[PDB]
Design a protein around this nucleic acid. Sequence first.
RNA 1: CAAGCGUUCAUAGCGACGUCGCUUUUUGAUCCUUCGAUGUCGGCUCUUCCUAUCAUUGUGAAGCAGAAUUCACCAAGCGUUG
RNA 2: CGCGGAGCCUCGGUUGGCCUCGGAUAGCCGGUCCCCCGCGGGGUCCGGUGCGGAGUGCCCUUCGUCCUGGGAAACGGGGCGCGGCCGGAGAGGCGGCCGCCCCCUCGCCCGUCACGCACGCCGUUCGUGGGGAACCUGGCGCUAAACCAUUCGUAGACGACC
Lengths: 190, 138, 175, 109, 247, 201
Amino acid sequence: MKTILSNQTVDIPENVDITLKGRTVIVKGPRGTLRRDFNHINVELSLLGKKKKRLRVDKWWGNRKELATVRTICSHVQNMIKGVTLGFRYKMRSVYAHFPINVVIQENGSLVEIRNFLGEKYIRRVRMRPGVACSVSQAQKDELILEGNDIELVSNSAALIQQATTVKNKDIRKFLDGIYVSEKGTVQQA
Amino acid sequence: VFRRFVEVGRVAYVSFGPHAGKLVAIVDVIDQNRALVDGPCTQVRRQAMPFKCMQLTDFILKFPHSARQKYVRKAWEKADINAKWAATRWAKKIEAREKKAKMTDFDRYKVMKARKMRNRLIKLEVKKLQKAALLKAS
Amino acid sequence: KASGTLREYKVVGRCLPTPKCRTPPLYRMRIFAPNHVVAKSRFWYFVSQLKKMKKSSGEIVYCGQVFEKSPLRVKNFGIWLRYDSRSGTHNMYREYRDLTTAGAVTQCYRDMGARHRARAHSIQIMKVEEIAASKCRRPAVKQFHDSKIKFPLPHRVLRRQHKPRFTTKRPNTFF
Amino acid sequence: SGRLWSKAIFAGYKRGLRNQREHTALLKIEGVYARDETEFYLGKRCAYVYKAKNNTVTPGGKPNKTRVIWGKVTRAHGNSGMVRAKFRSNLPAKAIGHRIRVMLYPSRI
Amino acid sequence: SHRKFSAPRHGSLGFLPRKRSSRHRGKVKSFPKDDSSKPVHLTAFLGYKAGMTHIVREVDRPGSKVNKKEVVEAVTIVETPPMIVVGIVGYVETPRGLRTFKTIFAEHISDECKRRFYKNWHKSKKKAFTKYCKKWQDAAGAAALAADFSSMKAYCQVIRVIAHTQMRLLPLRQKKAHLMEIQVNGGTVAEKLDWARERLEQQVPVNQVFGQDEMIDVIGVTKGKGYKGVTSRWHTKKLPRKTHRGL
Amino acid sequence: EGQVLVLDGRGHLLGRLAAIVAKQVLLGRKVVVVRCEGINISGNFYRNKLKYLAFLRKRMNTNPSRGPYHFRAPSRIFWRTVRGMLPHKTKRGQAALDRLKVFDGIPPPYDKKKRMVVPAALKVVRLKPTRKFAYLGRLAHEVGWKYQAVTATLEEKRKEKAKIHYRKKKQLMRLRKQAEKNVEKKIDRFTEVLKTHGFLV
RNA sequence: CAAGCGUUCAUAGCGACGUCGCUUUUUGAUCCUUCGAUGUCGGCUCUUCCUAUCAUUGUGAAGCAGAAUUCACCAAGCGUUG
RNA sequence: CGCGGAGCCUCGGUUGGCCUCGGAUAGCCGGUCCCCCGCGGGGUCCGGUGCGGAGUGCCCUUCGUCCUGGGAAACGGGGCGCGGCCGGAGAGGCGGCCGCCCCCUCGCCCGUCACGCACGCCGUUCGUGGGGAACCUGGCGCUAAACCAUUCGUAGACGACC
Ligand SMILES: [Mg+2]
Ligand SMILES: [Mg+2]
Ligand SMILES: [Mg+2]
Ligand SMILES: [Mg+2]
Ligand SMILES: [Mg+2]
Ligand SMILES: [Mg+2]
Ligand SMILES: [Mg+2]
């Protein structure tokens, strides 16, 4: 069964200005500008709301497996607004038993250096995606803070270092060592 | 974004099939591929018609969703579809495809001579405007 | 049985008179077939399943088409069914939204073929019945089903792809 | 001083798959792609025209180097606007994928 | 059935149109990727294997048994007189490959370099490059080889230098100099080029191409040994003593 | 039709285009498929790369050099698929393959000629928008092509030179439409008899 | 499929009573091919191929703390001897 | 290189089209008043087109000759017409743009006559100064190498190779 129509409206706040180039939305607010194409998803992005108030996505004569693509665009846009108004802040804490995990950033972010994981000599280096500002925190002992605007860029950089600190040939039920994402938050809370 | 929506009252130009080259008002939608369609004044009996064989215009009219051939005769008579079409450019490149196929061998000769002179007066001017765009470059 | 565009050939017929019973009853069935000769034959298939009657011991009295009383008015047809899948035999109700009872089961025969791979010789039409707005369960039909109906025709592919088989302009699909 | 012979290509002879019948030839006239389109060329004369190395007489002219097999269109062939034509001699299989010239002159307008 | 006791194969297939080589001077099949930031230099040279001998040296690889001990190393010595540049050649990148633009030889050429042009010399009149050398002093001494360097400057990407050996400085009985194209792995064509335009008719000693303790590659032709049996060629096993038809 | 054909392979389907090319070569017409790196095949990428590597594993064991020649450049890939639709074992089949001419990128004289499209083979027409598909340019690269980089840097240098041609031709039409309006009373009874017979409306 | 074993716990590892298959490295059945003869066991040598993976690369499982070890996945690249 | 005269042969063809990029639930063009970049490029606004008419359903150019004697159109075209400066390299093979000589007056309407009118009939009409092979005029240039024989081994069954 093809469904005749499904849609959903995004409530754009007053800080931001969204302006769509056909199917590629660009989103600029206080912190910066973000962009994301959607020339794979085949929907109608309307900007019906005036002065600027609604990004409305249609789908159209689509069936089950494409009607699902309606909201996933809707969310990819609010995440874009929530990233340019407040900005994402992923926190990750270092966990270990004996050997202290020794983090130090090296350019501004862009190089997270990890010594002494499980006592290993091999020093692990981890790039960051562009626009992600990694930083060693304060008001906590073993804790990094990854900031930026793109949820996509920030959270995979978090995974890049969460997946770099993995144990081999052990029972990871016992050896609970590594740097784990502890809190997916925001920069400003409002 | 779209601007021509299959509606109750949208006028459509019939692409091909038995009624090709006429206008028609969409009375009702039967299914995903078939519409109950009616052209009263363009001599099309009320019948089903697939969308794959009709391309829809910019006109609308305002009969209700199952009106009966007398109220769609109005709202097509007034608001004057039959004279507003034939003022479209659509209806003027139609009736140009018509007029090349309906062209004797004599006519085809007059235009061979007429166009040869037209193409030359316009050619001497373009050669003259470039003379002026090069003198302006000076 | 095969197809075409189906038609509503209704039939009546009695079990020809013996000396004992001189006025047997008459039975009308709404047989549903592409012409006479098979509409007569689908009758004896259904009366032999219900009465102790055969083509030899009987006779068809009236075979004639019954043709739609409202062919310019879209209607909602529910149609009860019984076919033969590869394992057993199952009963169904299905809804089709065309404007002529005949065409509405022409669609159904197309679907059991399309959605269940059931050929016409396996299917039996219990009874077709046109329905009002409500009492419609299938949302595939239940969605048109309003007043301010509205679509665009989004990705309008061009046929005529062999009128000019070679062209300079790449086509268009937005209109 | 131009065509006076609408262009056409000799595509093959009327055949099955593992048979072949050489009397009838299949012409693909240019600019006609519907079996409804082709009722104009029924009856027309065609002309395989070719030259080979020895002089051959010529009506209204001197001995040329040009010869022709000399044919006539019979009927349409398939939905696609092909045309079945049989020439007086059978075509030489050298002309497969070459020019023959359907003329206009046995016209029926 | 299968092989009872498995074993490796004899001799690598990665070598095996094992034929008499079609060339004699070792042809470079790939030159190093030219990083266009470091200065201009040559990538190859052309020497002559002479013999071998013992070396005695001190070793510095701490943690090994032979750290600060003396070892002996067998060393070849490749007699390598300075090579002479005669011409430059341009190459331009194509989908179909890497084509050659424009070869431009110098005004003089050599004597030894002429040898490499004809099979029999003393029978010939030695006319090679006797009218190309005429181009290098006239009006056309600007057309065919000044608009050409500008052409090779516009459309060329890779520039090699044709350079020949000096066969007269060696003890060898040969006099046919050996030419070879030696790519210039400098940076920025027109600097890659207004350096070899200078070194035309010029010497190039080995200390320009190579420095001490530098890893190089040697590209020559194996020593010849003729027709050989399967036992010498592919190093197979010998069959037992009893085999009737050959072992 | 008639003279030398030029088909721009971009936006086309490998086999869909190859079926139409091969019938027109067999009718004596000369075809030149260009830009074959833009040709694309239906079905997602990995499906096709995996399908191509199965071709490479087909090779005469006792000696490979005689065996099936797996070409790598896109043209030869495409040329192979046209050859698979011609009777190349006979004289008319090989005679056909010579009327064909397939290029990777877009070289001289053909770069300065209007090139056409086969919509019955075009991708935006035969394919559904919700399906994946691969480019014969990418497919060739991971199978062992060597000049994806060069054929790209060369066509960016030609796309910059042809943009100049169009911008000047775009400006000549600007003079024509302005000269048409600047002299429009001594061609008035000419443009009249053009639009009475459908020309120029 | 699952009654059970596994201190407890069906399914970590196993698995009865049953049941569905694959395979042609076992033997049979059969007698289609060859009796104007296809040289009818092993071993030696040599190549290549399969994966129903013993090792090694990368991994997921454990009744995996470490060590050791079984279970499973992508995998036939290179090994598999005196 | 130019331009000359015959003669085997191998054939196909019988106006051209001299070009953006690409998008496809979007594009094309204008014009920019305004802004940024290197006459252009990018941007923003607006105005037109979009079953595309600055549309390959397209565009271009003509297809009996000449006379002369009016109108509309008026410096176009040419003499392998001649020199110089460009631009183009992906397998370039093409154009483009400037001086000078001589000559011609040609597209469209009209008058005015003419041109073997071969007597109803077929391969007519061209890309054609085709492609290839042999031979008769002028000007400028030219001036060999290869293989054998010999020799050498860095090579070898002979060949081949240095
Ligand atoms: Mg362990
Ligand atoms: Mg001829
Ligand atoms: Mg083994
Ligand atoms: Mg013995
Ligand atoms: Mg228990
Ligand atoms: Mg024998
Ligand atoms: Mg396996």
